[PDB]
Fold:
Amino acid sequence: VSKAAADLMAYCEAHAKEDPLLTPVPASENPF
Amino acid sequence: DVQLVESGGGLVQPGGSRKLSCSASGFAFSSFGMHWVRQAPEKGLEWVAYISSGSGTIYYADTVKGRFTISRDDPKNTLFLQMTSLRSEDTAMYYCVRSIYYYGSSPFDFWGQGTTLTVSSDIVMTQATSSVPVTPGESVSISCRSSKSLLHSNGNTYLYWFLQRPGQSPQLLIYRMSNLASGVPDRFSGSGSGTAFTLTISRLEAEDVGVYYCMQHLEYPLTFGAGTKLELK
Amino acid sequence: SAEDKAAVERSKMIDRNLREDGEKARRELKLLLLGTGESGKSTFITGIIEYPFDLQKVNFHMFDVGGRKWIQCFNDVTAIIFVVDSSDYNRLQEALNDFKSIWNNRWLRTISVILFLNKQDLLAEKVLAGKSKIEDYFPEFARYTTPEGEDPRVTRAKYFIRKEFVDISTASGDGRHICYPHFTCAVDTENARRIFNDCKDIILQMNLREYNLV
Amino acid sequence: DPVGRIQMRTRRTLRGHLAKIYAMHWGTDSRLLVSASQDGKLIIWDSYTTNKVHAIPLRSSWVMTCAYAPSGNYVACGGLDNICSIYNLKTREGNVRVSRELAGHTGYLSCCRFLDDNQIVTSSGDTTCALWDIETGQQTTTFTGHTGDVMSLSLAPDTRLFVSGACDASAKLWDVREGMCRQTFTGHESDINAICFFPNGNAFATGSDDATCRLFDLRADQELMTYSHDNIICGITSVSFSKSGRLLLAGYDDFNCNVWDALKADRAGVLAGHDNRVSCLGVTDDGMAVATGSWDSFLKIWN
Amino acid sequence: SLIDEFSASVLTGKLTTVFLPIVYTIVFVVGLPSNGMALWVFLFRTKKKHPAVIYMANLALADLLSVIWFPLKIAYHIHGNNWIYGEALCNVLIGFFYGNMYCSILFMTCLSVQRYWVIVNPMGHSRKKANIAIGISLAIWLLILLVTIPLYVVKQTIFIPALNITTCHDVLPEQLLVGDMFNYFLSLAIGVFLFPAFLTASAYVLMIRMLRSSAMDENSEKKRKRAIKLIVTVLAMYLICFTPSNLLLVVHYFLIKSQGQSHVYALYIVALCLSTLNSCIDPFVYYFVSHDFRDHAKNAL
Structure:
């Protein structure tokens, strides 16, 4: 079972750079 | 299906005045804005006027400003253009054009068959390829040039392409520089960047013959190039 | 930017019609009818069933559902109309359970309830004949005494059933909403105007609190 | 390994609803929203310009779900009326019109979600979930097994499986093709008001009226994480994940959205600003904006 | 204002020496936070433009402006009617104190005629009528500004040599009191208080005439009976707080222009304390009288 949460964390870290709300992108490249 | 038919043309005596009428049918004309477009008998296209979806904004071409009066009657699905006074250079064909503006829109989707009003008694689009011979099976590509970059910071690029097949009204091929309009086969595609642009065709078909036209719609007035006449052989 | 500005005209055009439509989707008073099964729900005037009516030029739109949890959708209505026939007993305590579930619902604590005690004729005739005893179902009725042609026999019993419902009302609410009991017969034309008077009170009360006079 | 404070803030306010907002959906283009409210209108918003693109009048004012077709052509809505309506946006006549009125449910419609532009899966309060073919208007498959109203649906990224939440306090996972229940685990103490898929399709988060969320994975057969705080005792109305799941935005009846850390189960932020119970909550496809609608009649874009 | 052997007593006795400044201080200590806290909830915390909160919010503004300058006026009186801060500040305190005080009266009157047209003839117009509320609100602000501009130009700094004192507004030349300030104050009193008083008094009594009737439902004990008491309270405070002051104001300038016996200022100055005191009664009786307003303030702080 625990490897389910392990895989969830793996996905979160794998795509951790695609979240403008997790990590605010610069306003120069933002529609807001 | 969608269809726009206009009338009110014909020969006009010196010093006369005429009203062109464009009768919409089979679509929500009240939700569309209306354009009038001109084609000289052998000297390319030219924009005339504009009335928006809700008559809050109007525009005219410099050569007719004040003399003309664009009018619409939404509940009757009719559009007008009141012409005051007469000048010989007004001799040309006139066309009725629809356009609806929202994020994913395709302005200039449909064109009427036009009404002749021959008479007797701003950014510049240009294309060096005035005419060129072509044969079936080629992948001919046309090019048109702008006097100012059309890539406004939005990412939109308001260059347009049409095909005025023989004896036929213009049909919208590429809208906003790259987008394929309704009824256009896959053969056509526009590409490039900045100020000059390529309207590419693959596996040219016999129906891909006529006079192409390029206009830039960043701001009014709208201006045409001379187009590109294709001689099929 | 010329084409993008044209989109603003379409955007403001939409907002014009929304407020134009929003001024007629308001000024009509929504009402929810939650009468219990085997009752005179349909007599006093898709999954949802609607019945519009208007008195004194105020349009009412009453809503019924044949297909608990969707009730959260109706926390805007002017009032809830709970209709119960006052003649049965074996499910009258069940009817009182139904009223309490509505009066204490989380999303309905700001909504007044108009209570229609229909089928008073059946209760009136039923107790007048006396073929069955109320005390068998409501032992505490034996202690009741009236607080007020006209028959003094059954009217002793009539106010008891209203007393049972209002007791459930005053036990909570604390002035945020009120229960307006009523007696009616399924021939009476007054059913329509009773709701109109009652919604005026609800609307008037709403103003008293949102304009700081209470 | 926390994420500190996600001090998200309003960047737009999509005013224009005259009633309570109940659902909205992000178009695949990450720009166009479709929002449903009790006013009886569906509004296609251009989030970037705060421009209204379409307004769709509805036969039934009691909408409770809405959807945006992945192709961007069709929008669907459902409500107390047992009919799911599919609308066509790219009509050559210009105006939006209904394509099919999907009748067949015995009770109210709670959630609708398109599938490859020709199949739509809906769940109704009559304890049934259904898959439809839009052209014919028939139920291609009917799903039964709930002991109560089904309230929420969520399509997997692959769209081969979808999950449903019902007032029986159990989350049921279904197959569009096989047509029978795959998983039905439970554990909530009250109604499951909202459901959403984790971006990988292997998990989904439940929003329950007992003021607690739970994170489920198919392999686990049990809840992995539970989101709740002693100071929040109000039901969850909507849930949506972030582009990488870290930012589990959830709507609460206390007029604010609690921004929970999916992996850490800690209240890392609060998108306060609404005047009434926040009903719907959806994150863009690119992860660049979270749009929040509420019974206050305002849709807010946050970043 | 005072036009003297006997009038010098007013400028010397403890009446103005310690009683006016201390009573003014009592008003300031609560009027500022009371209305200040009211503005916090109405503007910063309340996120809805309900019509009622518009007039109430502006009223809270009118209360603050009347009292913010009191620290100068309280120190003015204890110094023995001596104005040490010069010409510009004297014209500021009097303009704000009188302009904002009469402006507060007007917003109270608009609330009375707002509740009427709401309770009587209920329509649910609160969703859209906000624009009318804003429009009338600024019209009143412009009215007071245009009516109060003569309070900044006219000269009031007289430095009577008998006591080596300059007394801002308390003393004025007979030239001004008889034909310049007479018109301003009498018109300000008759036009900006008495006429609004008739509108507000009629509105509230008409309200009570309907909140008790046979055309009103039976469930009353918690809602209608309570409201009647508050209406009388609000009207009671309005009538007794301002009528004795504006009444003596008309009495004073009436004697000046016809009899010269200008001693009534002794009663007017003390009577005007009630009008000042009303600046702190309003927050307690209007906004905090609400059941939920207390909860909203609790969330605010």
